[PDB]
């Protein structure tokens, strides 16, 4: 879905690179780890920069693991992560990039939005929507929906996957609900509000059937009950919204199906508060009333979610890509400056050590 | 006095061996969830914590899944959420992960504390980092989570003296010629009763010794 | 003698004989034995009623105030005794135990009425 200019690798190929043999840097890091001493971020940056084969990706994965479990794990630089993902894409190793992204705790791979988009678009271009969905879920887990391009791409992938899904595990429901709620909240259009309602419906089904802890545990979600009430609040907000804002019929149908299926361990809530299972009937009544209201005002969209998202993408992704490319240009320049500063510090320290030793 | 040099040697050697064989957080604060005992010492945890130990997450179990170990993010605690209605949280400023942990789920943290809606001026070390009591505030919820309107905190400005002490004060005044009819009064404006669950100074806290 | 840490506390040292207790209010190091070395004797307490049906308590209020101002702690029975004297507020546990006794006797009276 992204243009050739966005995914072009020429300018990262053109970065100033100081060449080393990966074996030498690997041996130096091995000796440093044997001595129980900290390895510099510059060393791992050089190691990742000098991947020249698919087997060197296997070696660099191990050394990324080792650096993550070292005293200077915090100092892994952003350009190193970007270069790792670039190398993985270059040498047909998207599986390794996805493995390191999924196990980000063990490898410290926390990409920026541009790198998420690169990986997601590679998977989309190769029609591997399962791995694209995995990347979208990883974006959700890191709460990296701060850039419009990532939001649009994730919404497209999520709706494409949902259009062909019937059997839902509650873990899958939770993941889909979070991954559609987070980008939907940042888009003030019909697609965004429909995504909000759909995700709230899914999360509310999970809350009612499996409990609220199943919803908020290890997720970027709040620990307050009332997700179905929040869906109904989205409906009410759309009722008082400007004309252009509408709601897809599919999202409303999903919410209705959830409510119709719901109306047919430690206690976390205060006993004085009314439980959601006791509020299901009034939720159903409110849903019916608000559905009739929205139908009356003509605030219901008949186009499917996937088609609407496709149209919105074709309308906005070009400008989003332009902005992202400019930010990427700026980031590359700043990364070059920082790397040169690190190299200078390392060289100054070595020469000073030499003037110490000559005495 | 006949010098005791073996004592000097023993103390120095023990100090060196304790400084070089330090047990790490991953070893000290590991827990066997089936028996809820510490493998390092074998001591079982108190009963009232058991459920939490099996349900909630340690702070760095959350931070190790975030970029930069979640610097600048807001982290709250389950116990604070249950006990207090006003917002309580830490704004992280510095994190020192325990690299020896497989999942990087042990370590130390520093931040700015806000307790019951009152923010502190400086950043200090966070206590109970290893407790299974921690929750991460979502970014899209922070604005709603941090919202707080400071209610009027008007408490008693003074209290009566105890009966006998009041009588003694009045008797002393009358003996010294004072005939004032004003009641003796104890000022309690300078006594701020801090809630027992407020974070203490982790910098002053000790550490389990290696054995 | 040097104790590792510790602090001064005003407490009751038990003397007398078997089945006849008597207490000396003393300010002493918390680590010292109950009836051992003390810094100063600050009073006395006879818990057995005398021929007049009275429990006699002697309190050196000046020295008690001095030692409290010097950083001395207080044992819980001393807090209760000083609350009874009116020198301190009544300790919360005296109030709570009084309420518990009231409820227990109310239950007993209700049992009698039910019978």
């Amino acid at each position: 879905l992204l243009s050739s200019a966005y995914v072009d690798s020429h300018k990262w190929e053109a970065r100033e690179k100081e060449h080393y043999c990966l074996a030498d840097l690997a041996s130096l890091m091995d000796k440093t780890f044997e001595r129980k001493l900290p390895v510099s971020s510059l060393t791992i940056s050089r190691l990742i920069d000098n991947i020249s084969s698919r087997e060197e990706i296997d070696h660099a994965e191990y050394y990324l693991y080792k650096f993550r479990h070292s005293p200077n794990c915090w100092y892994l630089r952003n350009w190193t992560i970007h270069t790792w993902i670039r190398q993985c894409l270059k040498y047909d190793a998207q599986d390794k990039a996805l493995y390191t992204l999924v196990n980000k705790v063990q490898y410290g791979i926390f990409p920026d939005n541009f790198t998420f988009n690169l990986l997601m678009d590679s998977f989309i271009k190769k029609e591997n929507y399962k791995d694209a969905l995995s990347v979208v879920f990883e974006v959700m887990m890191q709460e990296a929906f701060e850039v419009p391009s990532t939001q649009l791409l994730s919404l497209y992938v999520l709706f494409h996957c949902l259009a062909k899904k019937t059997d839902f595990s509650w873990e899958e429901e939770r993941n889909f609900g979070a991954s559609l709620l987070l980008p939907g909240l940042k888009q003030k259009n019909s697609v965004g509000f429909s995504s909000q309602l759909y995700g709230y419906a899914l999360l509310g089904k999970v809350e009612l059937q499996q409990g609220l802890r199943a919803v908020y545990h290890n997720m970027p979600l709040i620990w307050k009950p009332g997700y179905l009430d929040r869906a109904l609040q989205v409906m009410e907000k759309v009722a008082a919204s400007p004309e252009d804002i509408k709601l897809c019929r599919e999202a409303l149908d999903v919410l209705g199906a959830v409510l119709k299926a719901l109306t047919s361990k430690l206690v976390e809530q205060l006993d004085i508060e009314e439980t959601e299972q006791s509020k299901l009937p009034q939720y159903l009544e409110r849903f019916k009333a608000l559905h009739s209201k929205l139908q009356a005002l003509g605030k219901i969209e008949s186009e499917g979610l996937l088609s609407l998202t496709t149209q919105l993408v074709k309308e906005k992704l070009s400008t989003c890509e332009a902005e992202d490319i400019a930010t990427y240009e700026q980031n590359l320049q700043q990364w070059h400056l920082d790397l040169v500063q690190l190299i200078q510090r390392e060289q100054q320290q070595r020469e000073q050590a030499k003037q110490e030793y000559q005495a | 006095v006949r010098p005791r040099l073996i004592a000097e040697l023993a103390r120095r050697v023990r100090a060196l061996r304790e400084q070089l064989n330090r047990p790490r957080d991953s070893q000290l604060y590991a827990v066997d969830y089936e028996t809820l005992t510490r493998p390092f010492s074998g001591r079982r945890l108190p009963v009232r914590a058991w459920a939490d130990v099996r349900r909630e997450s340690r702070l760095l179990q959350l931070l190790g899944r975030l970029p930069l170990f979640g610097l600048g993010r807001l982290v709250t605690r389950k116990s604070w959420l249950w006990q207090h209605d006003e917002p309580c949280y830490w704004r992280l400023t510095r994190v020192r992960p325990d690299y020896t942990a497989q999942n990087l789920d042990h370590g130390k943290a520093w931040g700015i504390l806000t307790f019951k809606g009152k923010t502190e001026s400086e950043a200090r070390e966070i206590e109970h980092v290893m407790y299974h009591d921690w929750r991460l505030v979502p970014k899209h919820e922070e604005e709603a989570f941090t919202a707080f309107t400071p209610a009027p905190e008007d408490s008693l400005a003074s209290v009566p003296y105890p009966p006998l002490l009041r009588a003694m004060i009045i008797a002393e005044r009358q003996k010294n010629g004072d005939t004032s009819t004003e009641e003796p009064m104890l000022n309690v404006q300078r006594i701020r009763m801090e809630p027992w669950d407020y974070p203490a100074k982790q910098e002053d806290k000790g550490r389990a010794k290696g054995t | 003698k040097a104790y590792r840490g510790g602090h001064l506390t005003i407490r009751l040292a038990l003397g007398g004989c078997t089945n006849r207790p008597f207490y000396r209010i003393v300010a002493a190091h918390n680590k010292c034995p109950r009836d051992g070395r003390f810094v100063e004797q600050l009073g006395s307490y006879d818990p057995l009623p005398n021929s007049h049906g009275e429990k006699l308590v002697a309190l050196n209020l000046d020295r008690i105030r001095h030692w409290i101002g010097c950083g001395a702690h207080l044992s819980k029975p001393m807090e209760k005794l000083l609350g009874l004297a009116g020198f301190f507020p009544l300790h919360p546990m005296m109030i709570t135990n009084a309420e518990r006794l009231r409820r227990k006797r109310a239950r007993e009276v209700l049992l009698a009425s039910q019978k």
């Binding site: 430690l266 206690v267 976390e268 809530q269 205060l270 006993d271 004085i272 | 249950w82 006990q83 | 309420e99 006794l101 009231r102 409820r103 006797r105 109310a106 007993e108 009276v109």
Partner: peptide
């Protein structure tokens, strides 16, 4: 106590509660 605080305590001490005590007798029962 307010009802909300009592409910908070009941949640805090789930499964380890006694019967709630009302106001005590005003005078000492005879």
């Amino acid at each position: 106590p307010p009802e909300r605080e009592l409910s908070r305590l009941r949640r805090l001490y789930q499964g380890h509660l006694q019967e709630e005590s009302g106001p005590p007798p005003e005078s000492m029962p005879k």
